[PDB]
């Protein structure tokens, strides 16, 4: 069991050029692969999740080249649905943005492909997506547990009236939206009830439009898609910096700055996590917005009680930042924290208590009362990149913290600790 011990950080200040957005990167790679023409992506993220997508595209026959730092990618579009037979197995690690979108996209036409991944991926739900794809004609078989990967996809999605449950993951609707335009028949996607993580749907629609496709969004309750479309290369495309990755550094300044500026995202960003900055501001930090940067300057830090459904991932950063706030913080409407890399409500509560906090683990919320002073703990990270990055903030105090399996940050941010060190100052 590898580990990293962070010594106390007296102050943070500086500028971080953000790694590319994982959400945008994997969507752009899949659309570029399906599109006609050559797409040149820049500021692409090099992380495990993107590498698994690139490996899947390679296995499917897509041609592409990567620059030395793997942030520039020239993709030769396939000019239509991707194909493979012989129950070709695509190993997708822990990448939800590869598993959910490919589960739908590979249902176009005929195919015989198996999607699988790390053990935890076999415990992340996908039944709502499979249910929807089958209504549209796809043949899908669960090879292990019903409602979870691995899946054997044998094609057949032609379109039509499709209902989809949007209460557990926005990724199921995202997958359907990207796939439907290429189906031969028109599709009407009806959302059964609630829709969580709504901002991610906006990311998907923004990407689809860049690649030449638009659909009719009826107040997010129903989406009308015309079939027989084709994605088209947008030429050169700049991937936004990752707003979720940015949360750690902006939070660090709110706790111990100084001023930390993150570049690559700004007021015009399509990512919902830029709204994390609004939460820091509500807590007492100062935020500055630019066209290509967001910065945070230390002010004060007061507890908040907020519904965080719109920023589920960045919300985790508020849970550890809460250790430094005055009062009890409550984060609500975050049930799906339980069905991701790990059950994050259980993990976050468990690890927060280890450093001294009093924590109520609610079914779909978490209440955190900070201790007068933090204590040392060896933090378990549950194979979850965000647990490692969130708990790195514990070192913005008088106590060191040891993070187990620090390399798990590579899912989305291989250079995380070097970047945190870059803004860490002794004086
Ligand atoms: C969980 C994850 O990030 C997810 C990425 C994502 C997207 O569409 O890009 C939407 C959200 O899932 P949901 O709330 O709609 O289910 C994020 O939490 C991560 O980075 O941990 P993953 O990409 O593994 O699903």
Swiss-Prot record:
Q: What is its main location?
A: cytoplasm
Alphabetical list of InterPro entries matching this protein? Enolpyruvate_Tfrase_dom (IPR001986), Enolpyruvate_Tfrase_sf (IPR036968), EPSP_synthase (IPR006264), EPSP_synthase_CS (IPR023193), RNA3'P_cycl/enolpyr_Trfase_a/b (IPR013792)
Regulation of activity:
Competitively inhibited by glyphosate. Inhibited by (S)- and (R)-phosphonates analogs of the tetrahedral reaction intermediate. Inhibited by (R)-difluoromethyl analogs of the tetrahedral reaction intermediate. Inhibited by bromopyruvate.
- The UniProt record gives the binding positions of phosphoenolpyruvate as 22, 96, 124, 171, 344, 386, 411
Where 3-phosphoshikimate is bound, by residue?
Answer: 22-23, 27, 169-171, 197, 313, 336, 340
Give the UniProt keywords, A-Z: Amino-acid biosynthesis, Aromatic amino acid biosynthesis, Cytoplasm, Transferase
Effect seen on changing residue 101 to S: Displays a slight decrease of the affinity binding for both S3P and PEP. Decreases the binding affinity of glyphosate, reducing the potency of this inhibitor. Is insensitive to glyphosate but maintains high affinity for PEP
EC number(s) in its UniProt entry?
2.5.1.19
What the entry lists under SUPFAM superfamilies is as follows:
EPT/RTPC-like
Q: What's a Gene Ontology MF term here?
A: 3-phosphoshikimate 1-carboxyvinyltransferase activity
**What PANTHER family does the record point to?**
AROM/DEHYDROQUINATE SYNTHASE (PTHR21090), PENTAFUNCTIONAL AROM POLYPEPTIDE (PTHR21090:SF5)
- HAMAP family associated with the record: EPSP_synth
Q: What does this protein do?
A: Catalyzes the transfer of the enolpyruvyl moiety of phosphoenolpyruvate (PEP) to the 5-hydroxyl of shikimate-3-phosphate (S3P) to produce enolpyruvyl shikimate-3-phosphate and inorganic phosphate.
Q: How does it assemble?
A: Monomer.
> In its UniProt entry, what is this protein called?
3-phosphoshikimate 1-carboxyvinyltransferase
